[PDB]
Design a protein around this ligand. Structure first.
Ligand SMILES: O=C1[C@@H]2[C@H]3CC[C@H](CC3)[C@@H]2C(=O)N1c1ccc([N+](=O)[O-])c2ccccc12
Length: 247
């Protein structure tokens, strides 16, 4: 019933509202991205709260976990959309905001976009199924926490353990073949680990942009601006860190 729940709660299409009549400029692109980011955050919150066992977490931990993993979750899902929509050729942030190389450059996030596009390609190189994608995204929500722990660490550890086992099942079920399916699990865990460094570059870029937004003329929605100035700094200063499968 796990996979059914994931498929049932999976967010739908989310547009950015980008004016594709305009010629493209740093401000216009980033202003649309920030608006889309706020929109996606709202959907990620609803998605997370409807995940199996998620309400078992302390109230403060629930939001904490969502805010810390928000960027990684967006990276992962967007990498998936790009793979299934345009074969990783471009970055499908939204139906009305697709990034070609010109916008990657004009947005001033080229290196970050290069990393993300590489991630999207991995979905194809590894032949990731829709089901593995859903389970991995779920596990991604439980992959970053304060080094000093959450208000109720034990509950988080139990929930994380259960999602790892669900991923292990979706791999074991009629699909594999050999005796040691440590290979498919190994690469999927490696792929999830690869999201963290990308999220970190996006975190850094988001932080730097918010600090100088006043000049660059870029609006930051209320919720996104609070996460970037309250949550993000904690990740950048080393207080909250990703949980890596491999060292
Ligand atoms: O939120 C932000 C802005 C904040 C502030 C500056 C930029 C990165 C983070 C801007 C931005 O690009 N984004 C992003 C917006 C929307 C998506 N998405 O749903 O496709 C994103 C997916 C991956 C990475 C970032 C996404």
């Amino acid at each position: 019933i796990f996979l059914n729940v994931l498929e049932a709660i999976e967010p739908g299409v989310v547009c950015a509202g980008h004016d594709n009549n305009q010629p493209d400029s740093f401000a216009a692109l980033l202003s649309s991205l920030n608006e889309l980011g706020e929109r996606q955050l709202v959907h990620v919150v609803k998605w997370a709260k409807a995940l199996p066992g998620f309400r078992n977490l302390h109230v403060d931990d629930q939001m904490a976990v969502i805010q810390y993993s928000w960027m990684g979750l967006m990276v992962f899902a967007m990498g998936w959309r790009s793979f299934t929509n345009v074969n990783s050729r471009m970055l499908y942030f939204a139906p009305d905001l697709v990034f070609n190389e010109y916008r990657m450059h004009k947005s001033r996030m080229y290196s970050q976009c290069v990393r993300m596009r590489h991630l999207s390609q991995e979905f194809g190189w590894l032949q990731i199924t829709p089901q593995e994608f859903l389970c991995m995204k779920a596990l991604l929500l439980f992959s970053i926490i304060p080094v000093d722990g959450l208000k109720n660490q034990k509950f988080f550890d139990e929930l994380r353990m259960n999602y790892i086992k669900e991923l292990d099942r979706i791999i074991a079920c009629k699909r594999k073949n050999p005796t040691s399916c440590s290979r498919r699990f190994y690469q999927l865990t490696k792929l999830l680990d690869s999201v963290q460094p990308i999220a970190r570059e996006l975190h850094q870029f988001a932080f730097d942009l918010l600090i100088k937004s006043h000049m660059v003329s870029v609006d930051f929605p209320e919720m996104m601006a609070e996460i970037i100035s309250v949550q993000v700094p904690k990740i950048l200063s080393g207080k909250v860190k990703p949980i890596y499968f491999h060292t």
